[PDB]
Symmetry: C2
Subunit: 210 residues, 2 copies
């Protein structure tokens, strides 16, 4: 059972929780509560770079979000079937991670910059990223982003749709195929269970958790 | 067949890691340099940039954007991405740490930021890779075989030297890796003048 080392928050660990849940993989989380508990991990040599996310899986102590995700995606066959399919997936999810990164860092923006930053996020959502993924879906007409089969690209994108909805439920309104992808993936058995109350899914980051 | 075409600007930027990787693999490539804001807009309106950005690389019938999608495909095609899923995890863990440090350096272009770059090099990143090389005592970071981790790290070793030549001095195995990799024939060519390798900006 994979053991997830982070703090009790979405942060850089949430996308891993989503991906494991969608693959129907149960995991334990060992929450950090203190600088004390983080230094315990560092001193015990558990963090190659002195950083979390860290995941204990299959004998390894994997740090770096993208090392974790790439490994979970291959293990459970959500990475496509060849390196040309992995290149489409990689191009998609790196666009997603670029937008996700902007959203993840909004609350820590300097207060005088937050209005512009959020404005920018919305402009790129509407003009850059959502048209890109809508055009992909319109291009093959299939139910999945790559290979007409479920992959990490669908999981990562739908996860981001939920965060855009939290920011502005109007932004997806002009994108019908993204809408239909959000509902179809949400109603996959493992994803629907993860979205239901009492799962490991984490809330938005309020102030005290901040 | 057609050799890959790199669409970027005439600078290191986010394309240099791809220049190093193709060259160390011994793959010849062309560069179509973006010289104006009008050149970027033509690539957009032609539909060549999924997210309207460069780096973009035309290879094997695709126009791949995002540095990491490009690198992942090239590393796999030319057998520089480990032999199994577990070796990939080690490589990925290593190279993403290198990316984190490379990212700070790439965006320096201050004294406050550079002072922090230097401290994290001496006490976080350089010890981490030295530990990996001491742990197994082999010539390459992963699997006792040249991999993209070695290429990406040694390229960064070069940029750290540009910033402060003393930062490597307490790390002998990083020094040795730098020498061995730089002496591989494809990398030694790429390091010689007149290669696509790009100067500091």
């Amino acid at each position: 059972k994979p053991k997830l080392h982070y703090f009790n928050a979405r942060g850089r660990m949430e996308s891993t929780r989503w991906l494991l849940a969608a693959a129907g993989v149960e995991f334990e989380e060992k929450f950090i509560k203190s600088a004390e508990d983080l230094d315990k991990l560092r001193n015990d040599g558990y963090l190659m770079f002195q950083q979390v996310p860290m995941v204990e899986i299959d004998g390894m102590k994997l740090v770096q979000t993208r090392a974790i995700l790439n490994y979970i995606a291959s293990k459970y066959n959500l990475y496509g079937k060849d390196i040309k399919e992995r290149a489409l997936i990689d191009m998609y999810i790196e666009g997603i991670a670029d937008l996700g990164e902007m959203i993840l860092l909004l609350p820590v923006c300097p207060p005088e910059e937050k209005d512009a930053k959020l404005a920018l996020i919305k402009e790129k959502i509407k003009n850059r990223y959502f048209p890109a993924f809508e055009k992909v879906l319109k291009s093959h007409g299939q139910d999945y982003l790559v290979g007409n089969k479920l992959s990490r690209a669908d999981i990562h994108l739908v996860e981001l749709l939920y965060y855009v909805e939290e920011l502005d439920s109007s932004l997806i309104s002009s994108f019908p195929l993204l809408k239909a992808l959000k509902t179809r993936i949400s109603n996959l058995p493992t994803v629907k269970k993860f979205l239901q109350p009492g799962s490991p899914r984490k809330p938005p980051m309020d102030e005290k958790s901040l």
